[PDB]
Amino acid sequence: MLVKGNEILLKAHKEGYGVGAFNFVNFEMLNAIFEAGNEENSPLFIQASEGAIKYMGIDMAVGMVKIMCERYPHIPVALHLDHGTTFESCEKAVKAGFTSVMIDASHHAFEENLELTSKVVKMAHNAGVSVEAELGRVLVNPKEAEQFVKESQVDYLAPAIGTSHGAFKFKGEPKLDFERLQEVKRLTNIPLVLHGASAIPDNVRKSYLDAGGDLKGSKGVPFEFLQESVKGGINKVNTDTDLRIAFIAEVRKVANEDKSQFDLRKFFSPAQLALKNVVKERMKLLGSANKI
Amino acid sequence: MLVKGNEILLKAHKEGYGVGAFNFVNFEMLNAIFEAGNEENSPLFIQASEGAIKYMGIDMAVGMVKIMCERYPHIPVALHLDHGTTFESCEKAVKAGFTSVMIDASHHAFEENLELTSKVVKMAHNAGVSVEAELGRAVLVNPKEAEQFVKESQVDYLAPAIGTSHGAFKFKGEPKLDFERLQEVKRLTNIPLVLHGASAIPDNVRKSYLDAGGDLKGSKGVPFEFLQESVKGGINKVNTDTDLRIAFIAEVRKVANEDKSQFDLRKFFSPAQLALKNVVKERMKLLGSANKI
Numbered sequence: 001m002l003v004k005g006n007e008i009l010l011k012a013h014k015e016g017y018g019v020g021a022f023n024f025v026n027f028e029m030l031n032a033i034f035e036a037g038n039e040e041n042s043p044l045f046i047q048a049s050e051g052a053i054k055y056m057g058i059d060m061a062v063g064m065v066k067i068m069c070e071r072y073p074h075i076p077v078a079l080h081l082d083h084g085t086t087f088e089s090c091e092k093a094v095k096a097g098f099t100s101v102m103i104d105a106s107h108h109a110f111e112e113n114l115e116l117t118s119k120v121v122k123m124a125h126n127a128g129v130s131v132e133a134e135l136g137r138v139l140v141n142p143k144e145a146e147q148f149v150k151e152s153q154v155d156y157l158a159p160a161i162g163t164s165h166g167a168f169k170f171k172g173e174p175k176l177d178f179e180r181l182q183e184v185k186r187l188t189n190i191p192l193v194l195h196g197a198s199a200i201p202d203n204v205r206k207s208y209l210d211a212g213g214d215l216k217g218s219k220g221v222p223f224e225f226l227q228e229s230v231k232g233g234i235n236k237v238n239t240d241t242d243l244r245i246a247f248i249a250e251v252r253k254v255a256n257e258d259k260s261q262f263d264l265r266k267f268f269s270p271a272q273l274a275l276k277n278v279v280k281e282r283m284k285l286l287g288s289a290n291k292i
Numbered sequence: 293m294l295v296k297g298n299e300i301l302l303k304a305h306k307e308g309y310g311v312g313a314f315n316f317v318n319f320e321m322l323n324a325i326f327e328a329g330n331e332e333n334s335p336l337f338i339q340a341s342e343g344a345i346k347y348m349g350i351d352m353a354v355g356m357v358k359i360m361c362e363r364y365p366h367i368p369v370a371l372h373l374d375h376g377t378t379f380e381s382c383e384k385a386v387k388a389g390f391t392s393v394m395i396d397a398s399h400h401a402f403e404e405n406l407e408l409t410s411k412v413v414k415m416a417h418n419a420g421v422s423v424e425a426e427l428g429r430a431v432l433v434n435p436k437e438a439e440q441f442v443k444e445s446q447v448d449y450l451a452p453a454i455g456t457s458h459g460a461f462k463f464k465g466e467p468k469l470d471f472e473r474l475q476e477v478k479r480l481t482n483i484p485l486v487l488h489g490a491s492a493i494p495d496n497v498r499k500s501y502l503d504a505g506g507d508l509k510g511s512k513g514v515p516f517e518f519l520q521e522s523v524k525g526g527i528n529k530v531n532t533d534t535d536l537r538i539a540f541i542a543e544v545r546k547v548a549n550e551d552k553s554q555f556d557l558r559k560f561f562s563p564a565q566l567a568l569k570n571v572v573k574e575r576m577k578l579l580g581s582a583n584k585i
């Protein structure tokens with residue numbers, strides 16, 4: 001059933017595993033994520049960006065998720081606003097029924113980030129909703145993280161340790177500051193969040209290229225880095241790019257192999273399957289499989 | 293809001309216009325259909341086939357439509373089971389919250405078609421749900437059979453076979469519908485009538501699909517003029533699916549062709565929604581349901 005984000009992440013924190021946080025923009029993505037969680041017996045963090053909310057409408061984003069959680073009532077599910085940019089956005093998500101909200105003020109100076117985060121926390125906690133915030137851009141200062149968490153009362157923190165969003169994360173070799181991560185974890189003792197955590201697995205890349213796609217020199221976070229991140233105290237692992245590439249690879253394939261095909265289900269059934277398999281493998285990698 | 297199918301179609305029957313019945317299989321199709329109805333001030337008949345219901349799950353099919361009707365509460369909306377094949381399928385749709393169900397037993401002899409339809413009607417009417425049935429197969433409808441079939445079954449609307457078929461490939465040569473048979477059916481039954489396989493494949497939609505590398509294999513729809521004549525003859529519900537799929541997928545193919553690095557689903561499906569919406573808007577104007585709210 002649909003639960004506060006901290007309910008899922010406190011367990012992952014205490015037991016030392018990672019929960020993938022999977023973005024969706026429509027029914028097909030959402031269905032595949034849920035089927036993956038059902039098949040791997042894994043809790044689900046479902047995320048919607050502000051852009052996804054604009055595309056679906058917040059009423060449909062929440063409504064579809066509520067239908068899915070009634071279909072799979074044994075699965076712990078949190079519905080999370082990804083990269084909320086203003087207090088008002090976070091407040092709208094709370095009012096609409098989200099159970100976790102992220103306020104991203106990491107581009108502000110510490111004092112302003114702390115003030116805005118604290119405002120969001122007060123509002124969200126009054127409504128029984130968990131809150132994520134972000135520190136670092138430059139990498140996180142662990143002593144700032146310690147004070148920020150203590151003063152804001154935020155439920156989970158995304159510390160900058162070297163990742164970035166999209167398919168092009170490393171101009172060179174993948175590198176994450178695990179010593180910094182461990183220090184943040186030691187000083188905050190809360191669940192931590194890894195942004196930009198897609199891996200671009202070799203099989204997903206191969207499917208995309210076989211379908212005529214171009215991955216312009218892309219590079220994701222190696223599986224070993226994700227596992228080391230979880231060992232270091234990461235408990236929420238934001239995953240979007242991997243899902244899109246696997247989904248769209250199959251759409252492109254169907255378009256290429258039959259120019260007379262226009263049944264939407266013939267495009268999106270294989271697309272769902274590929275997305276589902278990415279999610280299932282990620283749940284096993286992160287250690288959330290068989291945790292229900 | 294969400295209403296019995298007959299509420300929408302009795303008005304169309306009495307005033308002599310047609311209401312498009314637009315199939316959907318996911319959120320993108322549904323959103324575009326609703327925005328079209330809002331922009332043209334038109335009632336909405338939303339249809340889901342058994343295959344679409346299996347794909348979405350009946351809980352999600354009904355649930356998404358209820359969310360959309362709350363987003364646009366001034367629009368009359370009926371949610372209709374398209375080509376239900378068994379009593380049990382129709383009953384499941386009634387229980388899930390559909391407001392209209394179609395039972396297609398037209399491949400049976402008259403007596404068996406009438407028996408099964410009557411069973412569906414009794415069940416659906418007891419739940420406040422309207423019912424469509426089909427007569428004729430290909431063999432065209434016998435108007436005197438239509439008259440007795442409607443009187444005995446109490447079905448709310450009838451799809452009489454007058455020369456259409458489903459899919460993109462409708463006519464081996466020139467389109468042809470039996471409008472005299474239609475008028476006789478209408479005169480004898482005096483209920484709303486339904487046209488199946490009513491996509492037109494407009495020139496611009498065909499051109500968009502071909503520009504995107506698609507192949508329509510010499511497909512031909514019902515010309516706009518034949519759709520208007522069918523409404524003049526008494527058609528009030530016009531089943532439309534293929535046109536929407538072609539317009540939508542044309543845009544998906546185009547995005548895939550023009551940017552090999554694009555994998556944002558919204559960049560594929562926003563232009564696809566727009567193309568589908570425009571097909572629906574034009575069809576609402578053609579059939580005469582625009583400005584009828």
Ligand SMILES: O=C(COP(=O)(O)O)[C@@H](O)[C@H](O)[C@H](O)COP(=O)(O)O
Pocket residue numbers: 023049050051052082083164165166167194195196197198199238239240241242
């Ligand atoms: O970190 C994230 C995903 O990382 P990824 O690119 O999958 O490595 C998410 O929090 C993103 O913020 C999200 O995918 C952005 O979505 P849109 O803003 O494009 O909808």
Ligand SMILES: O=C[C@H](O)COP(=O)(O)O
Pocket residue numbers: 315341342343344374375458489531533
């Ligand atoms: O006439 C019925 C529907 O258009 C067929 O749609 P389907 O391909 O989902 O069965």
Ligand code: NA
Pocket residue numbers: 081082083102132238
């Ligand atoms: Na987030």
Ligand code: NA
Pocket residue numbers: 373374375394424531
């Ligand atoms: Na029908």
Ligand SMILES: [Zn+2]
Pocket residue numbers: 083165195196
């Ligand atoms: Zn981020």
Ligand SMILES: [Zn+2]
Pocket residue numbers: 083165195196238
């Ligand atoms: Zn992010």
Ligand SMILES: [Zn+2]
Pocket residue numbers: 104134158195
């Ligand atoms: Zn971030």
Ligand SMILES: [Zn+2]
Pocket residue numbers: 375458488489
């Ligand atoms: Zn039919």
Ligand SMILES: [Zn+2]
Pocket residue numbers: 396426451488
């Ligand atoms: Zn039919």
